Amino acid sequence: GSSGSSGIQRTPKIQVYSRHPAENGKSNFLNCYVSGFHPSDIEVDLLKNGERIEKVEHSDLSFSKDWSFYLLYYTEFTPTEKDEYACRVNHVTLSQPKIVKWDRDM
Amino acid sequence: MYVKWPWYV
Amino acid sequence: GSHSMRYFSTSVSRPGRGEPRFIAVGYVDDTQFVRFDSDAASQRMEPRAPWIEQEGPEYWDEETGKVKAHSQTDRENLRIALRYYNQSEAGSHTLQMMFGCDVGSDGRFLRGYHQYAYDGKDYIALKEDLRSWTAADMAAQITKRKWEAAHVAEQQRAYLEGTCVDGLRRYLENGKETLQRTDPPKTHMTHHPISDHEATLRCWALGFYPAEITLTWQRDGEDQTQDTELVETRPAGDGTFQKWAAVVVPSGEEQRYTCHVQHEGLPKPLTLRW
């Protein structure tokens, strides 16, 4: 089965993190940055307690000097002590969607 | 300000 | 320091789902200011920084016109490349373009760029002298010969040394408060036990602009480079950037390590120790 991929494949590097250091009850932004990948088609979702958050926005598609692509997905949120957040990424180089949990110290 | 001429490979 | 303007354009074929999608974005240094998306409804070049909105309708009309023509040029270049390589029309292929200029602290032209990549790899590029081309394979040499015969290097150099520079200078002036700033990195160190024998020391840089930065780890004073995990510099979303570097440390040895931070908004380079 063919995939719709040409050229050397590069797996995305995934980071999930907040705009400002987290503080329960204060509004913040939850970011999922994916970078260094090829081809450019990619799927990113932010998860709140395992459920897709519905109006995440994202940067316009751009690329670095070495031609590999990067994208920022982001949504306003107000963290709490119990709510768990993650970023979920699908790309042709991954055997299944990758889930990266938000760690308030990363 | 964008370039004014692209052309053909 | 110096400044740069860059446009990055991407065309992606999608066989069986219509015509290739074209995205273009404009940057001054690490601040995006325009976008164009051939799949969007406006069919206009659109602003993406505050300081560019003050531009009149004459600007948005000529820019929209220039970027739409480029989108049509690269849609045909995708078809041409398919022939040069005799590739199947069922495959999805990518064509990327980067062009722009750098000025020095006087507004003097430092360098110009005008280059193409096909399926993620160099295709043809205008050399630093702005007078000849680098062609990365036999298909690109066909284009090189054509573009030599048609004086394309002369055409693009005229753009890079004139228009490109005039625009960058105008944007630097118009957005002095946002573009001619440096924000120094705020820095700290976090400590993460792994087991009972090992802990991660992480060295953090937050809130800095521009994006370029250097973070290194030392142990007794010698470079710890291949035992360092170093993430990609990442946008905060408010216009500043973030980065960390980490090392695994044996219990009790934390005080042997030093983190080192270099950034243009810093007067002198920083040293951090646990």
Residue numbers in the entry:
A (entry chain B): -6 to 99
B (entry chain C): 1 to 9
C (entry chain A): 1 to 274
Copy text verbatim from the article accompanying this structure deposition:
Peptide titration experiments defined a dose range of 0 to 10,000 ng/mL for SARS-CoV-2 and seasonal coronavirus with the highest affinity (e.g., HCoV-HKU1). EC50 for SARS-CoV-2 S was comparable to that for seasonal coronaviruses. The 9-mer peptides were identified at the equivalent position of the HLA-A*24:02 structure. Although electron densities of the peptide backbones were observed, those of some side chains were poor, particularly, Lys4 for three peptides, Trp5 and 7 for CoV2 and 229E, and Pro6 for HKU1. The conformation of these peptide backbones overlapped well. Of the nine positions, the side chains at positions P2, P3, P6, and P9 were involved in the HLA-A*24:02•peptide interactions at the bottom of the binding pocket. In contrast, the side chains at positions P1, P4, P5, P7, and P8 were directed to the solvent region and oriented differently in the complex structures. Thus, these side chains are expected to directly interact with TCR. A comparison between these 9-mer peptides and the peptides in this study revealed that all the peptides anchored to the binding pocket at positions P2 and P9, and conformational variations were observed at positions P4–P7.
Here, we identified the HLA-A24-high binding, immunodominant epitopes in SARS-CoV-2 spike region that can be recognized by seasonal coronavirus-specific CD8+ T cells from HLA-A24+ UHDs. Furthermore, to elucidate the molecular basis of cross-reactive TCRα/β recognition between SARS-CoV-2 and seasonal coronaviruses, we examined the structure of SARS-CoV-2 peptides and the relevant peptides of seasonal coronaviruses bound to the HLA-A*24:02 molecule. The crystal structures of HLA-A*24:02 and three peptides, namely, SARS-CoV-2, 229E, and HKU1, were determined. Overall, we found that the potential of cross-reactivity may depend on the interaction between TCR and the structure of specific HLA, i.e., HLA- A*24:02.
